Amino acid sequence: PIFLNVLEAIEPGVVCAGHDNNQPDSFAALLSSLNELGERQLVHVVKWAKALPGFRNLHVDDQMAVIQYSWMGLMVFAMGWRSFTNVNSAMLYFAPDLVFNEYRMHKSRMYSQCVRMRHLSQEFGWLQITPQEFLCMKALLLFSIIPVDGLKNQKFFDELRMNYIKELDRIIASCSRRFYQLTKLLDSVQPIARELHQFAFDLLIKSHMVSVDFPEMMAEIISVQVPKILSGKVKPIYFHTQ
Amino acid sequence: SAFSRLYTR
Ligand SMILES: CC(C)(O)C(=O)Nc1ccc([N+](=O)[O-])c(C(F)(F)F)c1
Structure with missing residues (x-):
């Protein structure tokens, strides 16, 4: 099973947030930790993506673009899986040192997004x-959000996305019923990532007022790339309508 | 960009 062998081999390990859990919770400290964890998870997403079958065939500018656009959905989907595997979806397992019960979901001011992520986990x-x-x-989530004006080499992206869809068909192979279920689940990631992008953007704009720290790469991506998604210049590729 | 500097390492 060459393809799956590779996906297993490149899967990131454990990433910690560095949060101080030995202190009462506050909005500013929870969100500063989520921002630091997002920067550390982005570094691991880069190393992972570069090692994917076929990814190096894309134009380098397209490699960078798709990672920056898809990062939030990749992170949502992986966190939902960790939450299921580690705590049976009872809490959101952002990191071993950043585990959200419902109180933290509320305190983060991201409660609706968190409930939707707990549902994904379930x-x-x-x-x-x-x-x-x-x-x-x-892996397919990396290839699920692109610019309306086109990638530099859009045809090579389309071919690589199709190959990943073929690998998903091979794993499924009753096949149609399962494909329907999995593509509905994949499509459900996108509105959650949309709502997290909106929250992240709004938080960056007010970050000095609320004492939340953003690392450099997070501030850049949320100000340069995220608004292309929010303004409808970059859109998900949905299976179902939508 | 900070991302592109990271990527091109
Ligand atoms: C607020 C913002 C930008 O820090 C953020 O959404 N961070 C963040 C960090 C990590 C993770 N994660 O997957 O472990 C996620 C999320 F994808 F779950 F939502 C968000």
């Missing part, structure tokens, strides 16, 4: 998602 159980389906679906 779906992993409800739909009996296998670890191999998880790995193939997460």
Whole structure:
């Protein structure tokens, strides 16, 4: 199983936030930790993406673009899986040192997004998602959001996306019913990532007022790339309508 | 960009 062998081999390990859990919770400290964790997860997403089958065939500017646009959905989907595997979806397992109960969900001012992520986590159980389906679906999320004006080499992106869809068909192979379930789940990531992008953007704009720290790469991506998504210049590729 | 500097390492 060459393709799956590779996906298993490149899967990131454990990433910690560096949060101080030995202190009462506050909005500013929770969000400063989420921002630091997002920067550390982005570094791991870069190392992972560069090692994916075929990814180096894309134009380098397209490699960078798709990682920056898809990062939030990749992170949502991986966190939903960790939450399912580690705590049976009872809390959101952002990191081993950043685990959100409902109180923290509320305190973060991201409560609606968190409830939707907990529901995603539960779906992993409800739909009996296998670890191999998880790995193939997460890779496909890298190839699921692009600019309306086109990538530099759009044809090479389309071919690589199609090949990942073929690998998902091979893992499924009753096949249609499963494809329907998995593509509905994939499509459900996108509105959650949309709402997290909106929150992140608004928080960056008011960050000095609320004492939240953003690392350099997070501030750049949220100010340069995220607004292309919010302004409708970069859009998800949905399976179902939508 | 900070991202592109990271990527091109
Ligand atoms: C607020 C913002 C930009 O820090 C943020 O959404 N951070 C963040 C960090 C990590 C993770 N994660 O997957 O572990 C996620 C999320 F994808 F779950 F939502 C968000």
